[PDB]
UniProtKB/Swiss-Prot annotation, chains A, B:
The gene is HPD. It comes from Arabidopsis thaliana. Fe cation binds at residues 186, 259, 345. Homodimer. The keyword Metal-binding applies. It is found in: Cytoplasm. This is 4-hydroxyphenylpyruvate dioxygenase.
């Protein structure tokens, strides 16, 4: 059941912003590890004396990396005279975020029809304001409300290239890397208590819960067409193996974004290219499941994937799950930075053609138990 | 003239430590861009609840990348019970350094015969103490004094693998990258006033000045065998083009390390491999000199390099200078991070065989004027 109760018109995920200590080095690492191109910048060379911001793109996926300059460069500025291209940016907030949480996502940005109205409706329905609506060059409006922890939900709306004040980057500096990633599928938060988090966010967006004993309890909030998907996790305390959600909250100093799921148009090619680069600057992957997990694939998805395609899943360490409507291919990276906090998921979905409907195959919940039993091959 | 007046026995450069916000991402970028292998770690997986530290190596060159964890992980610790592997590390100092200066060098480490004696002699001769001598596992002694700005000179001495508490890294995680870089040749500081900086450092080391109108005044301090080379720059104010030394001091919030010069055993191969990677996660290089600069190479170094080797310098943008004893090949990267502060120099020296004596060919001073005149080809 989909009650289509969005309180304002939401389009698609627009971008994800990381707050960094040095945006250059993180952006360059991510570009090589994920196959994203450098497409826009806002920094000293563009007149921005406040923050350095670099945009990576792959298909429709947009990753923004921002770090503060010395406050001394902009000490004579006031908000009415700022050279910052992102008006919500604040030196003190960014340095406090990074010292507290380490490298992580500050903003989950969605494109809406009217960011001014989205903000006003959100706060009238309980959203905690973070940055009021600001009109950039009479062309784009940005506004921010609190989502969970120190993560904000950013509304962006366009009258009619990323943002005013950003520049297209040099062709020579923009190598056309591409490993197949195409869009953000979903973005997952970790909180200490699921109930209050869900009520708060669903309360100000109108997002509805999306149709679904180790580690977590979870639930997914979805927009009207179910293309914006925001799952939220809480720990389950007191078991034998310590909850990875609890470990996250300890090392992150509280609630924050846990993982970003990136859709690939060819997950076999994406993982081939990412795994080739794991030990030469890219990203590492969780340990692969045992061969018994793939011996058990035939009975569950043997009508969807060939034996060769199943053998191909086994080489790359890909996980497979199944809903009533679709099939899910997925895999998880090791943490993206120093702390055991944020990581990335690569996914591809098959089934549910109409365009493909959102969340086709779900989110992999059945893999927890399929892993444990397959990891009970300590007798073979 | 070399008075050989070192006040304690100095061996070689040992390592350079960067203070970072996220050591993982900077270490991975540098590894790919420079061709250095991951060789040691000290982090949560090794029992260190205080800082994450990753060591990259190429030949004898050692780059250390360190970032702080949340202080909450180690809140019950005291210095006598610390899990830190580098006893001088302090959460507050590191976060303050990074917020003030951005990504940069915290420590220039040299190996000595007795770091305890080096520290005591240094401070008896005016060195400002930073971290007292500490004995690690009865095997290694580390001590630190202030060098300039917030950069420290670190003494390391070994009774008889990097440091106790560091672990050798997995073979699968240690890809054997190598672009030819082999050791640190020299490390250069930028200060507001050269005179007082030289007197302070030469005063506590006994290092002697090494035998040598746009931008800077400079001088080089050298150890007894002239294998440890520490140049220092000051700005020249009031000219037409703004001093790059002054720009550094503004963006860095004062004195700090300006550049690291890395010796290559094959500078043609090093620059081939680095330039291939510039736009896919590695490092960018300053713009190459005009063809007239290389047309003028024949008359200055035509007895040292063939026309083909000169043509090869032109393809890679390599600069060439000449002393009375030797010849110098050199090139400079763009800044390593967000701020126009620290950069890297790649160098190879030819001449002065005995082993090669230190500073053979000098440091490239003649290139300033050879560039200006060659850049006066706006008439050809
Ligand atoms: C669940 C779920 N619900 N929702 C909304 C989601 O998006 C979602 C996942 O993405 C998801 C699905 C399957 C697995 C994991 C995550 C996972 O972490 N592991 C094992 C593991 C990997 C790395 C570190 C520690 C433990 C799995 O088997
Ligand atoms: C001098 C000198 N004295 N000592 C001890 C040294 O180590 C030393 C150099 O390394 C050195 C030698 C030649 C050049 C540069 C540095 C340099 O920066 N440029 C142009 C340029 C490059 C990048 C940004 C702005 C301007 C040169 O032509
Ligand atoms: Co997921
Ligand atoms: Co130099």
């Amino acid at each position: 059941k989909n009650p289509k109760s969005d309180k304002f018109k939401v389009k698609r995920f627009h971008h994800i912003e990381f707050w960094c200590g040095d945006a250059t080095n993180v952006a360059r690492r991510f570009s090589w590890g994920l196959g994203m191109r450098f497409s826009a910048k806002s920094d000293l060379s563009t007149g921005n004396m406040v923050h350095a911001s670099y945009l990576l793109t792959s298909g429709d996926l947009r990753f923004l990396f921002t770090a503060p300059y010395s406050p001394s460069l902009s000490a004579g500025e006031i908000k009415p005279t700022t050279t910052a291209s992102i008006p919500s940016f604040d030196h003190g907030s960014c340095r406090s975020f990074f010292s507290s949480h380490g490298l992580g996502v500050r903003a989950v940005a969605i494109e809406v029809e009217d960011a001014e109205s989205a903000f006003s409706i959100s706060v009238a329905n309980g959203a905690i304001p973070s940055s009021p609506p600001i009109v950039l060059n009479e062309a784009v409006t940005i506004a921010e409300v609190k989502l969970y922890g120190d993560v904000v939900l950013r509304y962006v709306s366009y009258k009619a290239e990323f943002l005013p004040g950003f520049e297209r980057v040099e062709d020579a500096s923009s190598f056309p890397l591409d490993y197949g990633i195409r869009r953000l599928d979903h973005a997952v938060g970790n909180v200490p208590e699921l109930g209050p988090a869900l009520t708060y966010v669903a309360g100000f967006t109108g997002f509805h819960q999306f149709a679904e004993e180790s580690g977590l309890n979870s639930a997914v909030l979805a927009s009207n067409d179910e293309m914006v998907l925001l799952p939220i996790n809480e720990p389950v305390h007191g078991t034998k193996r310590k909850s990875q959600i609890q470990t996250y909250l300890e090392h992150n100093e509280g609630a924050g974004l846990q993982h970003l799921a990136l859709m690939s148009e060819d997950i076999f090619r994406t993982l081939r290219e990412m795994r080739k680069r794991s030990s030469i600057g890219g990203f590492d992957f969780m340990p692969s499941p045992p061969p018994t997990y793939y011996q058990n694939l035939k009975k569950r998805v043997g009508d969807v994937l060939s034996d060769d395609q199943i053998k191909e899943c086994e080489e790359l360490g890909i996980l497979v799950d199944r809903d009533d409507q679709g099939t899910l291919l997925q895999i998880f990276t090791k943490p993206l930075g120093d702390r055991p906090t944020i990581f990335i998921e690569i996914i591809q979905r098959v089934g549910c053609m109409m365009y493909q409907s959102g969340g086709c195959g779900g989110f992999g919940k059945g893999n927890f138990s399929e892993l444990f039993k397959s990891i009970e091959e300590y007798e073979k």
